[PDB]
């Protein structure tokens, strides 16, 4: 049997994307915006550093994975019960078509998450370059050097959060297609791990509540960078 509800970590009690997991990187981004602008030696490096932070946040906003997930969860509330009914009716052609649709939506959300991870990992390579340039070019105390160090410390764990979201959603897409492929081939009740269409819908609805909240919190935050 295959799990059609959200998979870890999206099934976690605490939604995995938010200040709980990204707050150190958020703070670092706020500090980078507000760096002082009196130092001549640092000015160009600091502009480049600030543009790197801003590029990554802008990329994040373009993708908006939590907002996209929340939209999916709304769809899931009706799409999974409809699929479950097709499974129970041993309706292979219907189940396949419905699962294909669900999977398409899941894989688009997963790609958005993956795109955020890619932006962060690419940002880390920029920070690596900046760290070396500034260690030599900017001998004394410069808050931008700390901002680069912050990026190096926090970007890869942050990227991993998004990679794990991507992995979960891609697995959900695989599972829903695989489930529909069994319809008409084995007994219907052996296909899904869950005991009802409603149980599956409720699990996506619960995730949707969390994703919606985060989407709105993030929207606020990015508009002040
Ligand atoms: C090359 C050269 O000459 C020099 C000088 C390079 C210097 C580079 C310096 C810094 C680089 C930072 C890069 C990336 C930052 C990224 C910051 C990201 C912050 C993200 C914060 C929160 C994210 C929340 C996501 C929510 C989305 C959702 O829930 O949908």
Nearest to 68, CA basis, from 116, 30, 14, 121: 116
142 lines ligand 1 (CB under 6 A): no
Please, what is the angle between helix 65-88 and helix 143-182, to 10°?
10
Atom 29 of ligand 1, nearest CA residue: 66
Ligand 1 atom 28, closest CA? 66
Tokens 């942050």 appear where? 158
Q: How was this structure determined?
A: X-ray
* 197-222 and 43-63 helices, crossing angle to 10°: 150
**Smallest Cα–Cα separation from 123: which of 44, 33, 56, 24?**
56
Q: Which of 100, 119, 77 is nearest to 211 (CA)?
A: 77
To the nearest 5 percent, what fractions of the chain are helix, strand and coil? Answer: 80, 0, 20
- How far is it, in rounded angstroms, from Cα 220 to Cα 217? 5
């Amino acid at each position: 049997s295959l799990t059609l509800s959200p998979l870890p970590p999206l099934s976690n009690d605490i939604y995995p994307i938010g200040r709980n997991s990204l707050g150190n990187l958020m703070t670092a981004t706020e500090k980078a915006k507000e760096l002082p602008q009196e130092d001549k030696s640092a000015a160009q490096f600091q502009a480049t550093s600030q543009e790197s932070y801003k590029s990554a946040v802008s990329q994040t906003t373009k993708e908006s994975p939590s907002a996209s997930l929340a939209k999916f969860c709304k769809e899931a509330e009706t799409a999974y019960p409809a699929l479950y009914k097709a499974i129970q009716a041993n309706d292979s052609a219907s189940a396949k078509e419905l699962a294909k649709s669900i999977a398409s939506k899941l894989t688009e959300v997963a790609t958005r998450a993956g795109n955020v991870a890619q932006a962060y990992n690419q940002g880390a390579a920029k920070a690596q370059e900046g760290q070396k340039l500034m260690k030599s070019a900017l001998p004394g105390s410069h808050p931008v050097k700390d901002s680069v160090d912050d990026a190096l410390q926090y970007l890869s764990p942050a990227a991993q959060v998004f990679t794990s979201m991507q992995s979960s959603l891609n697995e959900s897409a695989k599972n829903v297609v695989a489930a529909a492929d069994k319809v008409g081939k084995v007994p219907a009740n052996q296909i899904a791990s869950e005991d009802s269409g409603e149980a599956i819908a409720n699990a996506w609805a619960k995730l949707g509540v969390k994703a919606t909240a985060q989407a709105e919190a993030y929207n606020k935050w990015q508009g002040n960078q």
